[PDB]
């Protein structure tokens, strides 16, 4: 794969539908905990046992102290180099009539922190909620999301169960419903909103030039996406931190961390 930055700005210079996959090293160069590869824990446990509908069934108070936590976080993270030269791409872009899409597999909303408009969070986010009774979906950054997570979400091992009444969980607001929310965000085991893999390949149908940022391009989430657009003969330029492995069949690699090596990319 090459790693010519004039050789890739000369494909950029002339792109006129930009997508640009970003995975989680985009977040972990934040500070973003993501409670999953190695040392990665919330007390005992980490996301692929709190993610998932099977642990929200059986003890919905653990997974909303977990989720609260997450949420609560942000408010000491902020966008890297690498989210605004991703951002400010798509700003100047836009006044040439030029696309830039973000699909993303982050929740913490850092891309949108930082400007972008045009983000596709294909596994949801921590700042909406979904009604298990009525499935509306709602913006919600209050803090804390109900009086009674207050102080919960504590990670540190040895912390005791919140155990909060169902009836004291976040509950939606809509008239009439009531029922109980959960995070709108995709849990392990779970299908992928069909709409947003409609919008997601209609942007991959039409793209001229494929970014993957921050992740591996071998692997989920990027590994259901670039070949296709590699295989359309569109060029694919990877930048992420592991040496190559992954090996790539696409067009270009660039080592490093993402705030690194984007701004020169996309400037
Ligand atoms: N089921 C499942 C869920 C989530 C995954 C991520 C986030 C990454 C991956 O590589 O494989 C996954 C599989
Ligand atoms: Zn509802």
Redesign the pocket.
């Known amino acids: 794969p090459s790693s010519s930055m004039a050789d890739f700005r000369k494909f950029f210079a002339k792109a006129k539908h930009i997508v640009i996959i970003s995975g989680?090293g985009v977040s972990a160069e934040s500070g973003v905990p993501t409670f999953?590869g190695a040392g990665g824990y919330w007390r005992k446990w980490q996301?692929?046992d709190l993610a998932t509908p099977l642990a929200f069934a059986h003890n919905p108070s653990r997974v909303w102290e977990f989720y609260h936590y997450r949420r609560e976080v942000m408010g000491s993270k902020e966008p890297n180099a690498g989210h605004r030269a991703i951002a400010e791409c798509e700003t100047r872009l836009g006044k040439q009539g030029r696309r830039v899409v973000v699909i993303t597999?982050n929740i913490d909303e850092l891309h949108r922190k930082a400007g972008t408009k045009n983000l596709l969070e294909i596994?949801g986010s921590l700042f909406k909620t979904r009604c298990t009774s009525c499935g509306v979906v709602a913006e919600n950054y209050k803090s804390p999301i109900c009086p009674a997570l207050s102080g919960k979400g504590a990670p540190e091992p040895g912390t005791q169960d919140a155990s909060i009444p169902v009836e004291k969980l976040p509950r939606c607001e809509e008239a009439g419903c009531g029922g109980l929310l959960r995070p709108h965000v995709?849990?392990?085991?779970?299908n992928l909103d069909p709409a947003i893999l409609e919008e997601v390949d209609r942007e991959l149908a039409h793209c001229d030039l494929c970014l993957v940022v921050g992740t591996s391009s071998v692997?989920?989430?990027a590994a259901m996406f670039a070949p296709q657009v590699a295989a359309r003969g569109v060029p694919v330029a990877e930048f992420n931190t592991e040496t190559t492995p992954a090996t790539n069949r696409f067009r270009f690699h660039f080592q490093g961390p993402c705030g690194t090596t984007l701004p020169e990319a996309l400037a």
Request: aromatic content about 22%; hydrophobic content about 45%.
């Open positions: 989680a999953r996301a692929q597999q596994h995709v849990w392990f085991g779970e692997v989920y989430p």
